């Protein structure tokens, strides 16, 4: 995240890092089983950090379980970045608590100019890099789809919006992607992708949650 601002330990308990020996992802919990995030990070050896602030120190809120599955959406495109969506099941369920908590899923989809929460422990800067210890979080609003698209000429598909800030400075890195973007208690959007990180112009992109709950919904219950 760069621009953004330290959010506070276990002050967004739905935000997982996915960890293969080092943080590389992020993730939404969805219910005690299952985290909902990009198909971009699929790969193996995956375990879930669930309770995290500093992800380099043990604080004594953590659960670390590992994946037992990934599930990526079964039209994800790696090249257009099209159904950029994965559902992880933890291999036990997680003990649910105040610092270790669900998100909602959309029952609408959200309307440009709507204000959300972005979090992780992605890239802070726009030049050059820093990593931080402990979660990121910015603001940002959900931007027009024309605004979008003018940004990202034959880019953007039904299934992404962009969200921040067209003066750069404010956006989502690297390390971020597979994170949440909440809105009004509700997990509209999934870090994606963007055109380096806090560029003028270069919004971030991100999946579009609100089309994919009945997917969801129905992977949840046959998986
Ligand atoms: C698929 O969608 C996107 C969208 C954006 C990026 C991206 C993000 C940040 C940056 C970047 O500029 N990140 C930091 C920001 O400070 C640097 C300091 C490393 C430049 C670069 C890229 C890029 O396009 O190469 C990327 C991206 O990083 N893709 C990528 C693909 C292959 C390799 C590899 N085999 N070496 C590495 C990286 N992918
Ligand atoms: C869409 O498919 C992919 C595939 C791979 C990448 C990617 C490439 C390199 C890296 C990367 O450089 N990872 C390092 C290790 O070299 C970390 C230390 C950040 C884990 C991260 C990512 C990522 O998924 O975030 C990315 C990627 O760069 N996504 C991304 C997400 C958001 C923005 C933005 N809002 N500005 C920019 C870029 N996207
Ligand atoms: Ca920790």
């Known amino acids: 995240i760069v621009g953004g601002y330290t959010c506070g330990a ?90 270790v908590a669900s998100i909602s899923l959309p029952t609408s989809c959200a309307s440009a100019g709507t204000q959300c929460l972005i979090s992780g422990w992605g890239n802070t800067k726009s030049s050059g890099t820093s990593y931080p210890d402990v979660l990121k979080c910015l603001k940002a609003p959900i931007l027009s789809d024309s605004s979008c698209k003018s940004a990202y000429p034959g880019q953007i598909t039904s299934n992404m919006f962009c969200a921040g800030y067209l003066e750069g ?15 009004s208690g509700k997990l509209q959007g999934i870090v994606s992708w963007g055109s380096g990180c806090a560029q003028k112009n270069k919004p971030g992109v991100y999946t579009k949650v609100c089309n994919y709950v009945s997917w969801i919904k129905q992977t949840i219950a046959s998986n």
């Open 10 to 99: 276990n002050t967004v308990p739905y935000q997982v890092s996915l960890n293969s020996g080092y943080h590389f992802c992020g993730g939404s919990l969805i219910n005690s089983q299952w985290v909902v995030s990009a198909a971009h990070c699929y790969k193996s050896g995956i375990q879930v950090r669930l309770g995290e602030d500093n992800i380099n120190v043990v604080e004594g809120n953590e659960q670390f379980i590992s994946a037992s599955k990934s599930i990526v959406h079964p039209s994800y495109n790696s090249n257009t970045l099209n159904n950029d969506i994965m559902l992880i099941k933890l291999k036990s369920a997680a003990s649910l608590n105040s610092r």
């Open 169 to 183: 400075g404010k956006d989502s890195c690297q390390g971020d992607s597979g994170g949440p973007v909440v809105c």
